[PDB]
Amino acid sequence: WISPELIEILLTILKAVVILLVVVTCGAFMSFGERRLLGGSLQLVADMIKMFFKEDWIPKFSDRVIFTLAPMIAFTSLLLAFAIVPVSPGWVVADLNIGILFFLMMAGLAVYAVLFAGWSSNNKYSLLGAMRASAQTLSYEVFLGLSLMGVVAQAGSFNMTDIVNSQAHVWNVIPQFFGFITFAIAGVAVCHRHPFDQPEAEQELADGYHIEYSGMKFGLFFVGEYIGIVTISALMVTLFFGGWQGPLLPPFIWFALKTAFFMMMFILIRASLPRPRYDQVMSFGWKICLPLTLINLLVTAAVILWQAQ
Amino acid sequence: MEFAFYICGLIAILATLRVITHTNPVHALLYLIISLLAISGVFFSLGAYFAGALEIIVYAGAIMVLFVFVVMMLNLGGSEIEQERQWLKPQVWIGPAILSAIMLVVIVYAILGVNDQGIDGTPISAKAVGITLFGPYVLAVELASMLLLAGLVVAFHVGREE
Amino acid sequence: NLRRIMMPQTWKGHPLRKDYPARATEFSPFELTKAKQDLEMEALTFKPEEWGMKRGTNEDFMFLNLGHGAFRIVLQLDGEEIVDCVPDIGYHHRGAEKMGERQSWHSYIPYTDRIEYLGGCVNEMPYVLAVEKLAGITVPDR
Amino acid sequence: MDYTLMGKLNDMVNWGRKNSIWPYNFGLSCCYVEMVASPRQADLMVVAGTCFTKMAPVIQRLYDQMLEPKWVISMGACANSGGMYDIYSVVQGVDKFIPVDVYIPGCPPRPEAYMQALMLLQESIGKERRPLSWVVGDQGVYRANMQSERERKRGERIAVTNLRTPDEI
Amino acid sequence: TSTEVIAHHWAFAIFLIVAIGLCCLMLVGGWFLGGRALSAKFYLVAMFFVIFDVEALYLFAWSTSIRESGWVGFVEAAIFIFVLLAGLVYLVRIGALDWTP
Numbered sequence: 046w047i048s049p050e051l052i053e054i055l056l057t058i059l060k061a062v063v064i065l066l067v068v069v070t071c072g073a074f075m076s077f078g079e080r081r082l083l084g085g086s087l088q089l090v091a092d093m094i095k096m097f098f099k100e101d102w103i104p105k106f107s108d109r110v111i112f113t114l115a116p117m118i119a120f121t122s123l124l125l126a127f128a129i130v131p132v133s134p135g136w137v138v139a140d141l142n143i144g145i146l147f148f149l150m151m152a153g154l155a156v157y158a159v160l161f162a163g164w165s166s167n168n169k170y171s172l173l174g175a176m177r178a179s180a181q182t183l184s185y186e187v188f189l190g191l192s193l194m195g196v197v198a199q200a201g202s203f204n205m206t207d208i209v210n211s212q213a214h215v216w217n218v219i220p221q222f223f224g225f226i227t228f229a230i231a232g233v234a235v236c237h238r239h240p241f242d243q244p245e246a247e248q249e250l251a252d253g254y255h256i257e258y259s260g261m262k263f264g265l266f267f268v269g270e271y272i273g274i275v276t277i278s279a280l281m282v283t284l285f286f287g288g289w290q291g292p293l294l295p296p297f298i299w300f301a302l303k304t305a306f307f308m309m310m311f312i313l314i315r316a317s318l319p320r321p322r323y324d325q326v327m328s329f330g331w332k333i334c335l336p337l338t339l340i341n342l343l344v345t346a347a348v349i350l351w352q353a354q
Numbered sequence: 355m356e357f358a359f360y361i362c363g364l365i366a367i368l369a370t371l372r373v374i375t376h377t378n379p380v381h382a383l384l385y386l387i388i389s390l391l392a393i394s395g396v397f398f399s400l401g402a403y404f405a406g407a408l409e410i411i412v413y414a415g416a417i418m419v420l421f422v423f424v425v426m427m428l429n430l431g432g433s434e435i436e437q438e439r440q441w442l443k444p445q446v447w448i449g450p451a452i453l454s455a456i457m458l459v460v461i462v463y464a465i466l467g468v469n470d471q472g473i474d475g476t477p478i479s480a481k482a483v484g485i486t487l488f489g490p491y492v493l494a495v496e497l498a499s500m501l502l503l504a505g506l507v508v509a510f511h512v513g514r515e516e
Numbered sequence: 517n518l519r520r521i522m523m524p525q526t527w528k529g530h531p532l533r534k535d536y537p538a539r540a541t542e543f544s545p546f547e548l549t550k551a552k553q554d555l556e557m558e559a560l561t562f563k564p565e566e567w568g569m570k571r572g573t574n575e576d577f578m579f580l581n582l583g584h585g586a587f588r589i590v591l592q593l594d595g596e597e598i599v600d601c602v603p604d605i606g607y608h609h610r611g612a613e614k615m616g617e618r619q620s621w622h623s624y625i626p627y628t629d630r631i632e633y634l635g636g637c638v639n640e641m642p643y644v645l646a647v648e649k650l651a652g653i654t655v656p657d658r
Numbered sequence: 659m660d661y662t663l664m665g666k667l668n669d670m671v672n673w674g675r676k677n678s679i680w681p682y683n684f685g686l687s688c689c690y691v692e693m694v695a696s697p698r699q700a701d702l703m704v705v706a707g708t709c710f711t712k713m714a715p716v717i718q719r720l721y722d723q724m725l726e727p728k729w730v731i732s733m734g735a736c737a738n739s740g741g742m743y744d745i746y747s748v749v750q751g752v753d754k755f756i757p758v759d760v761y762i763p764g765c766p767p768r769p770e771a772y773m774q775a776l777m778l779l780q781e782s783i784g785k786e787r788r789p790l791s792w793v794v795g796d797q798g799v800y801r802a803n804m805q806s807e808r809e810r811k812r813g814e815r816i817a818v819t820n821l822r823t824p825d826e827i
Numbered sequence: 828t829s830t831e832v833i834a835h836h837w838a839f840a841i842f843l844i845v846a847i848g849l850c851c852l853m854l855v856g857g858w859f860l861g862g863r864a865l866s867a868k869f870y871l872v873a874m875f876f877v878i879f880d881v882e883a884l885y886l887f888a889w890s891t892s893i894r895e896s897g898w899v900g901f902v903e904a905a906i907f908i909f910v911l912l913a914g915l916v917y918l919v920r921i922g923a924l925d926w927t928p
């Protein structure tokens with residue numbers, strides 16, 4: 046039962062399992078780091094044990110399937126969106142032809158977490174807060190793809206390995222700078238993170254949709270959000286900062302350093318930058334970021350076609 | 355790539371069958387999302403990678419979101435139709451079921467007897483679809499932009515509150 | 517709208533009357549469950565006539581309850597605009613004046629403290645100044 | 659020790675509940691502003707202030723919203739017994755209607771008294787017996803009958819002889 | 828039919844299966860363990876999202892083959908983007924995208 050093809054198959058399977066486990070544990074450690082900065086592994090073990098052994102109480106007047114289904118979406122959507130990220134040569138889960146399209150599919154499915162949580166939580170204020178949160182994330186998902194499309198236009202493909210190999214000389218943060226800032230804004234807004242933290246806080250008619258979620262469902266929401274930051278940072282690295290490419294260090298060391306830097310940058314962005322109003326946020330999205338992405342794609346295409354002799 | 359097609363097609367058929375015979379709107383939309391995921395799996399099994407990507411991105415990820423938005427906004431809590439449940443009464447559904455079954459047998463009889471060497475499953479990339487889209491189908495792109503513009507104007511004129 | 521502002525509306529007697537017993541009565545679990553039941557469908561059985569409000573549901577006015585201390589205020593909103601509001605108080609009533617009749621002039625001083633608890637000696641000052649007026653005391657300069 | 663109504667993992671669960679406690683602080687009165695999560699997620703309720711009769715139902719409702727296991731700390735003389743407010747509008751103690759695990763005297767207590775409450779509750783959870791799952795084992799809780807803190811600290815307290823005279827800062 | 832391709836397909840399948848199973852098993856363990864005791868602007872925003880997402884998919888298809896489409900494809904996409912931006916400016920100016928009027 047020994048064959049090198051099978052050895053390659055189980056080796057790639059082990060690589061994918063290791064990537065998955067590192068992503069979940071790294072999101073949990075991000076939860077610890079945000080809780081501490083604003084042993085520790087033993088504290089997270091204690092917290093996880095408490096979520097295990099606390100009773101899980103679904104409300105009597107709530108739909109059980111939707112209520113249970115929303116935390117699975119909030120976890121699995123971006124945790125499966127990580128699967129296209131190449132962390133090292135020979136260390137990618139899937140070398141998809143669609144790639145960044147698969148990230149867009151996972152974000153489009155990810156909006157159902159907030160929608161389903163707000164509907165199943167039988168409360169009018171929670172429902173209105175969920176409508177506000179879903180309107181916000183749709184208002185920023187409307188330009189997430191085009192801010193990505195500048196980079197896709199430069200690389201000429203949707204494959205992440207091809208994007209990284211196209212960043213071999215110059216990293217994409219220099220030409221696709223406006224794509225970079227719009228992608229950072231939209232990736233923060235998709236994960237419902239600061240300054241897009243609580244759209245329900247602008248009105249006493251609205252409450253959080255994480256309310257009435259207790260135990261492992263609340264833990265799933267928390268760890269899914271932190272995993273979302275992890276994969277948004279990793280996609281930002283692979284799309285705009287050369288991925289694993291660096292001068293002297295091993296490639297995974299460079300990728301991990303850039304991902305950790307962007308994770309801590311999102312931490313200080315939460316800690317420092319204040320919260321705008323709801324109408325200000327939606328107006329900023331629809332009126333600034335989408336035209337900026339469209340003009341960025343047009344200018345990128347003109348530059349590409351000009352420099353083709 | 356054949357197993358994936360057959361299981362995804364069976365899942366899609368079962369999902370829409372549970373869509374049309376369900377009473378809760380959010381449950382029906384959930385089964386509709388499951389059907390769209392299965393149909394995108396069918397697309398990926400055939401090599402239409404761009405089609406499956408757009409099926410999850412747009413159909414299961416934008417239009418179904420609009421449906422869920424409308425459902426949670428109108429707040430359907432059993433407005434005299436859930437408590438009535440007329441579509442599961444045999445005298446209501448038996449007629450259209452036989453009519454649709456007759457149409458299905460006629461269409462399926464037309465499908466069979468056609469020459470068929472099989473779908474190869476070779477991937478048709480988003481590259482080639484983009485080349486065709488902005489090559490021989492330029493006017494389709496511009497007039498589809500005008501079509502979506504018309505839908506935007508109509509839906510704004512009707513659906514705003516005032 | 518002449519209704520009760522310290523005690524709940526289902527309260528019997530007027531506590532600052534001299535024949536009202538000052539000290540706390542026996543605790544009843546059944547009255548606690550009754551008051552919890554009254555809190556359960558307070559919003560469902562909300563009549564905006566028992567608060568002095570008007571035009572209750574134009575089909576655009578929304579009635580809400582809200583939550584320096586915790587207190588409720590019922591809000592009438594046209595969209596996001598406040599049309600009327602009635603702050604519901606008395607959730608922090610401690611019977612301080614009735615206690616003033618149950619303590620000596622000396623032993624009432626801690627109760628003066630606990631009114632306006634961010635103030636302390638500021639709240640002591642008017643009470644001891646008034647008692648010194650009653651006693652005919654002129655305090656020295658120190 | 660006495661209790662009132664395969665072993666290592668029970669201690670691990672008790673430890674996980676011990677060093678991971680999420681409080682829900684109830685405002686009520688002056689004890690809160692001295693001592694300064696949804697009730698579904700919180701597992702410790704800290705009641706710090708007077709139990710007015712108009713908002714004893716609020717306290718009981720937000721206690722019933724919490725989930726098992728749930729512990730209660732009562733801060734201050736008001737929450738302990740009614741304190742100095744034995745008057746018509748005040749419930750004489752939190753423990754008249756919800757069970758209390760730790761009592762903290764003071765009017766108000768210090769913040770370090772709250773921290774000592776947290777320690778006392780921490781060993782209180784640390785040597786208690788709670789069921790592992792809803793289908794396996796005895797479905798009963800067993801709180802430990804701890805030695806009283808005034809019985810334990812009696813010798814050192816009685817041994818005190820001299821204190822600083824009150825004419826200094 | 829390369830062994831790298833089938834190995835990556837198996838790795839992707841195991842990734843998805845183990846991830847969904849990890850989430851489901853974690854919720855199963857959370858459930859089993861432990862003892863017991865509106866405005867129309869939301870529609871408008873979602874509808875604008877759907878319309879602009881379909882026009883986004885058009886630009887998605889354009890972006891991956893810009894070099895193969897040449898300058899004529901650039902001109903066509905420029906007309907598309909100008910029409911899209913005119914519709915966006917129209918929605919902004921008529922107050923459709925103004926959340927607080």
Ligand SMILES: CCCCCCCCCCCCCCCCCC(=O)OC[C@H](COP(=O)(O)OCCN)OC(=O)CCCCCCCCCCCCCCCCC
Nearest residue numbers: 118121122140141142143154398477836839840843844847
């Ligand atoms: C409660 C459970 C609900 C359902 C959960 C999901 C159900 C399915 C789980 C099992 C999946 C088994 C494995 C599927 C096949 C994986 C490999 C694959 O798709 O390969 C095909 C293709 C390869 O493309 P490429 O490598 O570029 O080209 C090779 C040239 N022939 O690659 C592709 O075509 C890749 C594109 C398809 C990727 C699909 C990924 C799963 C999508 C479902 C996400 C669910 C999110 C959470 C729930 C949402 C709301 C319900």
Ligand SMILES: CCCCCCCCCCCCCCCCCC(=O)OC[C@H](COP(=O)(O)OCCN)OC(=O)CCCCCCCCCCCCCCCCC
Nearest residue numbers: 355357358361362365388391392394395398399475828836
């Ligand atoms: C098992 C019994 C049922 C259990 C419950 C349901 C679970 C989900 C079952 C359906 C989805 C998985 C089907 C099995 C796929 C296994 C992978 C496979 O067949 O890959 C082949 C092919 C790879 O691509 P290709 O390069 O063309 O391959 C030839 C070699 N070069 O692959 C392809 O070309 C594309 C592969 C399919 C597309 C990706 C997966 C789509 C998943 C859709 C999920 C829909 C919702 C499911 C909800 C379940 C609960 C009700």
Ligand SMILES: CCCCCCCCCCCCCCCCCCCC
Nearest residue numbers: 064067068071132133295297301304
């Ligand atoms: C936040 C970072 C998330 C990373 C997820 C994937 C982790 C995979 C770990 C792979 C380690 C080995 C990489 C190949 C060898 C080159 C580097 C050697 C020194 C580490």
Ligand SMILES: CCCCCCCCCCCCCCCCCCCC
Nearest residue numbers: 492493496497897898899902903906
């Ligand atoms: C290959 C180099 C070409 C250089 C010249 C490019 C410009 C000339 C050709 C322009 C063609 C434009 C076609 C636009 C069609 C728009 C249809 C709109 C319908 C509503």
Ligand code: SF4
Nearest residue numbers: 688734735736765766
């Ligand atoms: S015990 Fe004293 S400090 Fe605490 S709430 Fe009562 S009066 Fe205020």
